[PDB]
Short mmCIF file of C-alpha atoms in Angstrom, two decimals:
data_model
loop_
_atom_site.label_atom_id
_atom_site.label_comp_id
_atom_site.label_asym_id
_atom_site.label_seq_id
_atom_site.Cartn_x
_atom_site.Cartn_y
_atom_site.Cartn_z
CA UNK A 1 0.00 0.00 0.00
CA UNK A 2 1.48 3.41 -1.14
CA UNK A 3 1.07 7.02 0.05
CA UNK A 4 2.45 10.16 -1.57
CA UNK A 5 3.60 13.38 0.01
CA UNK A 6 5.46 16.55 -0.93
CA UNK A 7 6.84 19.73 0.52
CA UNK A 8 9.31 21.08 3.06
CA UNK A 9 12.93 20.08 2.63
CA UNK A 10 13.30 21.03 6.40
CA UNK A 11 11.77 17.65 7.38
CA UNK A 12 12.99 15.55 4.40
CA UNK A 13 15.88 13.88 6.33
CA UNK A 14 13.31 12.76 8.95
CA UNK A 15 10.53 11.78 6.52
CA UNK A 16 13.04 9.74 4.52
CA UNK A 17 14.21 7.82 7.63
CA UNK A 18 10.61 7.29 8.88
CA UNK A 19 9.56 6.05 5.41
CA UNK A 20 12.31 3.41 5.45
CA UNK A 21 11.62 2.35 9.06
CA UNK A 22 7.80 2.40 8.58
CA UNK A 23 8.22 0.17 5.50
CA UNK A 24 10.36 -2.29 7.52
CA UNK A 25 7.76 -2.41 10.28
CA UNK A 26 4.52 -2.49 8.26
CA UNK A 27 5.33 -3.21 4.59
CA UNK A 28 3.72 0.12 3.56
CA UNK A 29 5.46 2.58 1.24
CA UNK A 30 5.68 6.34 1.78
CA UNK A 31 6.88 8.48 -1.09
CA UNK A 32 8.02 12.01 -0.34
CA UNK A 33 9.16 14.78 -2.68
CA UNK A 34 11.43 17.46 -1.23
CA UNK A 35 10.22 20.59 -3.07
CA UNK A 36 9.94 23.29 -0.37
CA UNK A 37 6.95 24.44 1.68
CA UNK A 38 5.55 26.60 -1.11
CA UNK A 39 5.61 23.54 -3.35
CA UNK A 40 4.05 21.44 -0.57
CA UNK A 41 1.13 23.82 -0.10
CA UNK A 42 0.61 24.03 -3.87
CA UNK A 43 0.62 20.25 -4.48
CA UNK A 44 -1.79 19.46 -1.59
CA UNK A 45 -4.13 22.27 -2.72
CA UNK A 46 -3.93 20.77 -6.32
CA UNK A 47 -4.73 17.27 -5.02
CA UNK A 48 -1.62 15.70 -6.57
CA UNK A 49 -0.40 14.29 -3.21
CA UNK A 50 -2.01 12.61 -0.15
CA UNK A 51 -0.20 15.08 2.17
CA UNK A 52 1.57 18.38 1.90
CA UNK A 53 4.38 19.49 4.20
CA UNK A 54 5.26 23.05 5.28
CA UNK A 55 7.29 24.72 8.03
CA UNK A 56 5.04 27.85 7.85
CA UNK A 57 1.79 26.90 9.57
CA UNK A 58 -1.32 28.11 7.80
CA UNK A 59 -3.91 29.96 9.85
CA UNK A 60 -7.44 28.61 10.48
CA UNK A 61 -8.98 31.00 7.88
CA UNK A 62 -6.68 29.62 5.13
CA UNK A 63 -7.21 25.97 6.19
CA UNK A 64 -11.02 26.41 6.17
CA UNK A 65 -10.90 28.05 2.74
CA UNK A 66 -8.77 25.18 1.35
CA UNK A 67 -10.62 22.37 3.20
CA UNK A 68 -7.40 21.31 4.89
CA UNK A 69 -6.41 20.03 8.28
CA UNK A 70 -2.97 20.79 9.69
CA UNK A 71 -0.86 19.10 12.38
CA UNK A 72 2.79 19.12 13.44
CA UNK A 73 5.15 16.27 12.57
CA UNK A 74 8.41 17.15 14.37
CA UNK A 75 10.42 20.12 15.70
CA UNK A 76 13.78 21.19 14.25
CA UNK A 77 15.83 24.35 13.97
CA UNK A 78 17.17 26.72 11.36
CA UNK A 79 20.86 27.47 11.71
CA UNK A 80 23.12 30.04 10.08
CA UNK A 81 25.92 28.13 8.26
CA UNK A 82 29.18 29.56 7.00
CA UNK A 83 32.08 28.77 4.70
CA UNK A 84 35.04 30.22 6.65
CA UNK A 85 38.54 28.72 7.05
CA UNK A 86 39.41 27.17 10.43
CA UNK A 87 36.02 27.65 12.06
CA UNK A 88 34.60 24.62 13.88
CA UNK A 89 30.76 24.16 13.86
CA UNK A 90 29.18 26.18 16.69
CA UNK A 91 32.24 28.35 17.25
CA UNK A 92 31.19 31.46 15.32
CA UNK A 93 28.86 33.67 17.32
CA UNK A 94 26.24 36.04 16.04
CA UNK A 95 23.50 37.98 17.89
CA UNK A 96 20.08 38.03 16.19
CA UNK A 97 20.48 41.73 15.45
CA UNK A 98 23.93 41.09 13.90
CA UNK A 99 22.61 38.15 11.85
CA UNK A 100 19.87 40.52 10.64
CA UNK A 101 22.41 43.19 9.66
CA UNK A 102 24.43 40.59 7.73
CA UNK A 103 21.42 39.40 5.73
CA UNK A 104 20.29 43.03 5.16
CA UNK A 105 23.72 43.80 3.64
CA UNK A 106 24.48 46.38 6.37
CA UNK A 107 27.43 44.29 7.67
CA UNK A 108 29.30 43.35 4.49
CA UNK A 109 32.75 42.18 5.63
CA UNK A 110 33.81 39.27 7.90
CA UNK A 111 36.21 41.66 9.75
CA UNK A 112 33.33 44.07 10.58
CA UNK A 113 33.88 45.41 14.10
CA UNK A 114 30.66 43.71 15.42
CA UNK A 115 31.69 40.26 14.15
CA UNK A 116 35.26 40.55 15.49
CA UNK A 117 33.97 41.77 18.89
CA UNK A 118 31.52 38.86 19.19
CA UNK A 119 34.27 36.36 18.21
CA UNK A 120 37.46 37.00 20.26
CA UNK A 121 40.30 34.69 19.15
CA UNK A 122 38.62 33.72 15.90
CA UNK A 123 40.52 34.42 12.68
CA UNK A 124 38.22 36.32 10.31
CA UNK A 125 39.18 37.20 6.73
CA UNK A 126 39.21 40.79 5.41
CA UNK A 127 36.71 39.71 2.72
CA UNK A 128 33.09 40.25 1.59
CA UNK A 129 30.32 38.25 3.30
CA UNK A 130 28.67 36.30 0.45
CA UNK A 131 24.95 35.82 1.20
CA UNK A 132 23.11 32.67 0.23
CA UNK A 133 19.33 32.43 0.66
CA UNK A 134 16.56 30.22 -0.68
CA UNK A 135 15.24 30.89 -4.20
CA UNK A 136 12.06 28.76 -3.78
CA UNK A 137 9.04 29.31 -1.43
CA UNK A 138 10.48 28.07 1.82
CA UNK A 139 9.35 27.24 5.31
CA UNK A 140 13.00 27.49 6.44
CA UNK A 141 13.04 31.09 5.00
CA UNK A 142 9.71 31.72 6.76
CA UNK A 143 11.09 30.76 10.21
CA UNK A 144 14.40 32.57 9.53
CA UNK A 145 12.75 35.83 8.34
CA UNK A 146 10.12 35.57 11.11
CA UNK A 147 12.95 35.37 13.71
CA UNK A 148 14.81 38.27 12.00
CA UNK A 149 11.66 40.43 12.10
CA UNK A 150 11.39 39.88 15.88
CA UNK A 151 15.04 40.84 16.59
CA UNK A 152 15.77 43.43 13.89
CA UNK A 153 13.46 46.37 13.46
CA UNK A 154 15.18 47.33 10.14
CA UNK A 155 14.70 43.77 8.82
CA UNK A 156 11.00 43.77 9.88
CA UNK A 157 10.31 47.04 8.03
CA UNK A 158 12.51 46.46 4.95
CA UNK A 159 12.11 42.72 4.33
CA UNK A 160 9.62 41.31 6.78
CA UNK A 161 8.73 37.63 6.73
CA UNK A 162 7.29 34.92 4.51
CA UNK A 163 7.99 31.77 2.53
CA UNK A 164 9.51 34.18 -0.01
CA UNK A 165 10.95 37.63 0.81
CA UNK A 166 12.75 40.31 -1.28
CA UNK A 167 16.33 39.68 -0.27
CA UNK A 168 18.50 42.82 -0.39
CA UNK A 169 21.27 40.62 -1.83
CA UNK A 170 23.04 37.32 -2.31
CA UNK A 171 22.44 34.19 -4.40
CA UNK A 172 19.42 31.94 -4.27
CA UNK A 173 19.70 28.18 -3.83
CA UNK A 174 16.88 25.70 -4.45
CA UNK A 175 15.83 23.81 -1.34
CA UNK A 176 17.89 23.27 1.84
CA UNK A 177 20.24 21.12 -0.34
CA UNK A 178 20.76 24.02 -2.76
CA UNK A 179 21.60 26.48 0.05
CA UNK A 180 24.02 23.88 1.53
CA UNK A 181 25.61 23.35 -1.91
CA UNK A 182 26.06 27.12 -2.54
CA UNK A 183 27.58 27.62 0.92
CA UNK A 184 30.08 24.83 0.20
CA UNK A 185 30.88 26.28 -3.23
CA UNK A 186 31.45 29.91 -2.16
CA UNK A 187 34.28 30.86 0.20
CA UNK A 188 33.31 33.44 2.83
CA UNK A 189 29.63 32.62 2.46
CA UNK A 190 26.71 32.54 4.91
CA UNK A 191 23.40 30.80 4.47
CA UNK A 192 20.72 29.21 6.62
CA UNK A 193 19.59 25.57 6.65
CA UNK A 194 17.69 23.12 8.90
CA UNK A 195 20.31 21.62 11.33
CA UNK A 196 20.17 18.13 9.73
CA UNK A 197 21.65 19.57 6.54
CA UNK A 198 24.58 21.20 8.42
CA UNK A 199 25.21 17.89 10.29
CA UNK A 200 25.04 15.56 7.23
CA UNK A 201 27.43 17.89 5.37
CA UNK A 202 29.77 18.51 8.36
CA UNK A 203 29.30 22.27 7.79
CA UNK A 204 30.17 24.92 10.36
CA UNK A 205 26.87 26.23 11.73
CA UNK A 206 27.07 29.18 14.15
CA UNK A 207 26.05 29.70 17.74
CA UNK A 208 23.34 32.40 18.24
CA UNK A 209 22.49 34.45 21.32
CA UNK A 210 18.94 33.74 22.54
CA UNK A 211 16.42 36.34 23.93
CA UNK A 212 17.67 35.47 27.45
CA UNK A 213 21.18 36.64 26.39
CA UNK A 214 22.75 33.15 26.42
CA UNK A 215 25.09 31.77 23.76
CA UNK A 216 23.44 28.67 22.35
CA UNK A 217 24.59 25.84 20.12
CA UNK A 218 21.90 24.41 17.89
CA UNK A 219 20.99 20.83 18.82
CA UNK A 220 18.02 18.66 19.90
CA UNK A 221 18.45 19.97 23.51
CA UNK A 222 18.22 23.66 22.56
CA UNK A 223 15.35 22.98 20.14
CA UNK A 224 13.49 21.12 22.94
CA UNK A 225 14.14 24.02 25.33
CA UNK A 226 12.49 26.37 22.79
CA UNK A 227 9.60 23.90 22.25
CA UNK A 228 9.06 23.70 26.03
CA UNK A 229 7.30 27.08 26.04
CA UNK A 230 4.96 26.19 23.09
CA UNK A 231 1.28 26.50 24.09
CA UNK A 232 0.00 23.84 21.65
CA UNK A 233 -3.09 23.11 23.81
CA UNK A 234 -4.51 26.62 23.12
CA UNK A 235 -3.48 26.78 19.46
CA UNK A 236 -6.16 26.36 16.79
CA UNK A 237 -5.09 23.93 14.04
CA UNK A 238 -1.67 23.97 15.80
CA UNK A 239 -1.03 27.39 14.21
CA UNK A 240 1.97 28.39 16.33
CA UNK A 241 5.40 29.80 15.45
CA UNK A 242 8.06 29.05 18.11
CA UNK A 243 10.92 31.39 17.05
CA UNK A 244 12.77 33.61 19.58
CA UNK A 245 11.72 31.29 22.39
CA UNK A 246 12.22 32.45 25.98
CA UNK A 247 14.40 30.91 28.66
CA UNK A 248 18.05 30.24 29.16
CA UNK A 249 18.55 27.17 26.96
CA UNK A 250 16.37 27.90 23.95
CA UNK A 251 17.72 27.96 20.39
CA UNK A 252 16.22 31.18 18.94
CA UNK A 253 15.30 29.84 15.46
CA UNK A 254 13.42 26.73 16.54
CA UNK A 255 10.65 25.65 14.13
CA UNK A 256 7.94 23.02 13.58
CA UNK A 257 7.16 21.17 10.39
CA UNK A 258 3.44 20.77 9.64
CA UNK A 259 1.57 18.23 7.60
CA UNK A 260 -1.53 19.24 5.52
CA UNK A 261 -4.33 16.88 4.45
CA UNK A 262 -7.85 17.26 3.05
CA UNK A 263 -10.53 17.04 5.70
CA UNK A 264 -12.87 15.34 3.16
CA UNK A 265 -10.60 13.15 1.04
CA UNK A 266 -11.75 11.81 -2.32
CA UNK A 267 -9.71 8.64 -1.45
CA UNK A 268 -10.70 7.53 2.00
CA UNK A 269 -8.40 4.45 1.87
CA UNK A 270 -5.28 6.51 1.07
CA UNK A 271 -6.20 9.19 3.63
CA UNK A 272 -6.60 6.54 6.34
CA UNK A 273 -3.26 5.05 5.19
CA UNK A 274 -1.68 8.54 5.49
CA UNK A 275 -2.93 8.93 9.05
CA UNK A 276 -1.68 5.34 9.69
CA UNK A 277 1.86 6.54 8.68
CA UNK A 278 1.66 9.71 10.84
CA UNK A 279 0.34 7.78 13.87
CA UNK A 280 3.34 5.42 13.48
CA UNK A 281 5.78 8.36 13.17
CA UNK A 282 4.44 10.09 16.28
CA UNK A 283 4.08 6.95 18.41
CA UNK A 284 6.91 4.73 17.14
CA UNK A 285 9.35 7.05 15.33
CA UNK A 286 10.72 9.21 18.17
CA UNK A 287 14.20 7.58 18.29
CA UNK A 288 14.60 8.34 14.56
CA UNK A 289 13.72 12.00 15.20
CA UNK A 290 16.25 12.34 18.08
CA UNK A 291 18.91 10.56 16.01
CA UNK A 292 18.61 13.23 13.31
CA UNK A 293 18.59 16.04 15.96
CA UNK A 294 14.90 16.76 15.59
CA UNK A 295 12.66 16.94 18.63
CA UNK A 296 9.99 14.30 18.53
CA UNK A 297 6.53 15.54 19.48
CA UNK A 298 5.86 15.02 23.22
CA UNK A 299 3.00 12.74 24.40
CA UNK A 300 0.40 15.47 25.24
CA UNK A 301 0.95 17.00 21.79
CA UNK A 302 0.57 13.54 20.13
CA UNK A 303 -2.71 13.07 22.10
CA UNK A 304 -3.96 16.49 20.92
CA UNK A 305 -3.07 15.55 17.31
CA UNK A 306 -4.83 12.18 17.44
CA UNK A 307 -7.92 13.95 18.85
CA UNK A 308 -7.63 16.51 15.98
CA UNK A 309 -7.54 13.62 13.44
CA UNK A 310 -10.69 12.22 15.03
CA UNK A 311 -12.63 15.48 14.88
CA UNK A 312 -11.37 16.95 11.55
CA UNK A 313 -10.92 13.89 9.30
#
């Protein structure tokens, strides 16, 4: 029995692993196309897939208009990644305001006084910062630009947030893989990817300062610390963005991937089979999530989701 899904590259490393493990355990096949959140929303609204995947949650008004249900799948994090010589992953430090100024093109050199001051003892080149951003409609760009809007008033007014924004500069890469590839190809570059892409490529991601003023390294622990303040119980359709999370251990660009399905499917058998996969992922696929440095959904959230499936589908 075969289900089809498409969307967010943010969750693709996890969906791929779950699909292989779910097949071993049940004999069922899950097919997933990594095409970005914009692509995911478009394909599910076109009815070409059984599920769409996006890291930008849709609001209740949009879900009602489209006849869709929405639920989280797993929590991850967006991380700034760099191509700098002699920098270990996590070593480079940026505040949210400084990261905003870099992506705005206000801070254009690696030896800019703010970068040097935040990184004592780090050797920085006297070269241009080469920006890399997503070219496609992206949930990773949504969570990144959403975070930047909260910590940079100039970013909020000039660029704002969304699956696509008007980037002041840089090159555009397709998908998280395309941003990773461009960062590897260009010396002195800076991009943003979901943590699993920095880890599989052995790329230097940066530390970021959280709203509590602590220097944080992106990992399942810091993502979980950010997720700990999420009020999922009071969210409608799980519409909640968890960037700039409070508290001492939170990674400031923590994000949730969401799955989208039709509340009244034309194929009841395939829709039931889709929910069969997601129930397995949330109940039996937590080790796989932790292994890839995602945060598996906690039990109360899984209960809320299963109740949502019951009432909406």
